[PDB]
Every structure is written in structure tokens, then in C-alpha cells.
Amino acid sequence: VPRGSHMTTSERVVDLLNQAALITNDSKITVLKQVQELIINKDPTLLDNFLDEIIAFQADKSIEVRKFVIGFIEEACKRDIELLLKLIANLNMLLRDENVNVVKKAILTMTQLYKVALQWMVKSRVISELQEACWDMVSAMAGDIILLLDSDNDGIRTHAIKFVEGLIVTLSPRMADSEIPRRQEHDISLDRIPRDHPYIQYNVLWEEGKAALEQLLKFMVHPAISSINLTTALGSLANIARQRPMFMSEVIQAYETLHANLPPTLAKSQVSSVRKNLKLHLLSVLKHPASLEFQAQITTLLVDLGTPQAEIARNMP
């Protein structure tokens, strides 16, 4: 940027905001992404200052512009979680956008932010009424996403499933046999939450996580479940079993149920697609050290799906 070394960052940011206002097409996102980089990474002390000017674009007619705003909210809260106090309302209204792509993007963002806010709540020594109300908002938004399992849009259902997956993992304890993705090493989980915490109740969360799981198992036996929703769910159950092996029992039961009762609304090629994924996820749970207690059952399913004996052995220890 010519004479960029002579600028204050706040001047650069104002210039760029006014430039973005001048642009009447999606190339404005390029500009707005420069602004994001500046006030989130280069000089985060300028975040609050300029927040409203970026959030104002939430009412742009462009789909992509609104998706960029959601992305910005995610990164802003990651940099300084206290901004959730004034951004949880914006995010929830974006969750109710008329365009499904914007809704799906808000769901993915909540998949990232629910666990960051919960850590915020847990690390806090003292909590304002405003902070309590923010947790209530986050928490009821989670419930709203769970209810999107019953949306009439297949893509919104898929995204809800991934949010529910994340929630179940967050709301249950890591154990000795958990396989934890490296990206997620420092994510909060149940065991991390003090039993005597002043505001967050361990047993409440535990019951909410189990109830999110039961919701998921219910949804998987819904009689019109789509090909894609069912494969998304089967994959999530495999993630859940690998990261939270106390549920492996539940997952194997789900797979047994599904194998014996394929939803009959699936077209021929959908049945095939689903069976291939069931096999794939079964092998995957097999490889997990905790599958020892389920090994005969998993083997029997695998044989019924035509898995060769040598392919089964290949996925043992």
C-alpha cells in the first residue's frame, strides 16, 4: 500500500470503509476483508471503535456480503469474546435470514462460538446480569438450531446435524480413550468444568448433552429421513464415538437399528450411498481402541454388508 507506513491504522480503516461504501458489487467484500484483517489482527484495540460500521453491512442485499458479516462476527468474538454481549442479537437475526445460505453460514459460526462462549462463562470469576443474559441467548440459540433438525430444507438439516454433533462433544467429558483432533486440543469439555461453579451447572449441561444425543438418535429413525441427512448423522455418530467413547454403545446400537431397518423412502442409489457410508463408519469405529467391547457385533454387520474378511482384519489394531 503506497505510503502505508505513514498511515495510522484507523485512517486506513476509515478510508477503506468509505471505499467499500462506494462499491456497488461483491468486490466490496475484498475491501471489507482488508478492514477485518486490520482491526482484528493488526490493531485489535480498534475493534470496538469500528464494530458498528462493519455490522451495518448486515443489511446489504448481497448474500455474500451478509455471509461476510457472519464470518466477521465469528472472528471478532474469537479475538474478544465480550463482544458477544452486543453481537449475539445480530447473529440470531442472521440465523433467521430469508436466504438459506446465510442461515447455513450462521449455523457453522455457532458451531464455532457456542464452545468459546461456554469457556468464557466457565473462566469468569464474576458474572454480570448482562453476561448471564448473553449466555441465555447463546443457549436458546443452540436450542433453536437443534429444532432446525425439523426444518423442511435438506441443507439446513445437514448443518443442524453438524451443530448438534459439536454440542454433544462439548457437553460430555474427554476420557482416556478419546481421539482428540489437534485443532481441538484446547476446546472446553465437561470434565474441564468445576463441579461447584457459581453459575454454570455441570449436571444441567450433562443432561442437555444427553438430550441433544437422544434428539439425534430419534432423528435418524425418522421415516422420511433424506439420503444426505442420514449419511451426515452416521458420520457425526462416528465422530462422537471416537471422541467420546462412553457413547460408543449408543452409536453401535444406532448402526444395528439402521442396518436392520433401512428407511424405505430412499431411492435405489441412495440406499447404495448410505450402505457404503455405514460400512465406512463401521470400519472406522472398529479401528478405535475402545471398540473392543463391540467387536463381534461390528464384525457381524460388516460381514452382512459384504466386507471381505481380509478387509476387516486390516482394520483391527
Partner: peptide, 9 residues
Amino acid sequence: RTFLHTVCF
């Protein structure tokens, strides 16, 4: 022709 179809993430 048959079209298999799945999602990855």
C-alpha cells in the same frame, strides 16, 4: 445411469 451421492466435510 446410476448416480451415487454423499457429502463430506
